[PDB]
Amino acid sequence: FREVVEILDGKTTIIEGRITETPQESPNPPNPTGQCPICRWNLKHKYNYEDVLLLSQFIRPHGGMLPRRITGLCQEEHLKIEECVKMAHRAGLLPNHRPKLPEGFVPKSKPRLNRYLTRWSPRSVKPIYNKGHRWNKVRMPVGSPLLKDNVSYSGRPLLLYH
């Protein structure tokens, strides 16, 4: 991995690019002929929002996702992983992947509401005051439709709207 360091001395600035050792891929993938990382490690339709050990492999230290041209994923797997990362960040998983602000960490606010499988942004949803009757019912989306193809051991389809 590459880092940029800045040095200031006597109104003179020097920026340097330092390369440190980075982890490499594990020696034995179960499906070596796959052209895609997830699809060759046999994790397709196998991860969820709570699999942080996989979701944190490729995200920036401040929580941002990594570009597809760098990660190597196929488009659908990239979208699924991006949605899973968003859901984990909203649920509260990955607590060390946030920027550090000492000035803003002191003014504590109201306690965070526990949540999980959150599809939309918490600040963009309006409360459903009407809620409809049985024939026209306003359903609350839960989870994401991108993960509707995950393996279901019980056989019951996931309730994405409830």
Partner RNA sequence: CGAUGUUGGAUCAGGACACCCAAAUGGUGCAACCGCUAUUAAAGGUUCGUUUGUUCAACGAUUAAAGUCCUACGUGAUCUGAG
Partner RNA sequence: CACAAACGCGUCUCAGAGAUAAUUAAUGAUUUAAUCUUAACCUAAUUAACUCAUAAUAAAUCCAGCCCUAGAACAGGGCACA
83 annotated as belonging to a binding site for a ligand: no
82 binds, among Zn ion, another protein, RNA, none (CB under 5 to 8 A by kind): RNA
121 versus 136: smaller Cβ distance to another protein: 121
Length of the chain: 162
Among 129, 135, 151, 154, binds another protein (CB under 8 A): 129
Site string for another protein, 51-90 (x = CB under 8 A): -xxx-xxx-xx--------xxx-xxx--------------
**H or E segment to which residue 7 belongs:** strand 2-8
Tokens 């996702």 — which residue?
65
CA distances to 10, 32, 52, 121 from 55, in Å: 44, 21, 5, 19
**H or E segment to which residue 102 belongs:** helix 102-105
Site for RNA in 42-81 (CB under 7 A): 60, 62-69, 78
Contacts of 80 (CB under 8 A, 6+ apart): 47, 146, 147
Instruction: Establish if 146 lies at the interface with Zn ion (CB under 5 A).
Output: no
Instruction: Establish if 98 lies at the interface with RNA (CB under 7 A).
Output: yes
Shortest separation between residue 155's beta carbon and RNA, angstroms: 29
Report the C-alpha gap between 147 and 162 in whole angstroms: 16
- Binding-site residues for Zn(2+), in ranges, read 36, 39, 74, 77
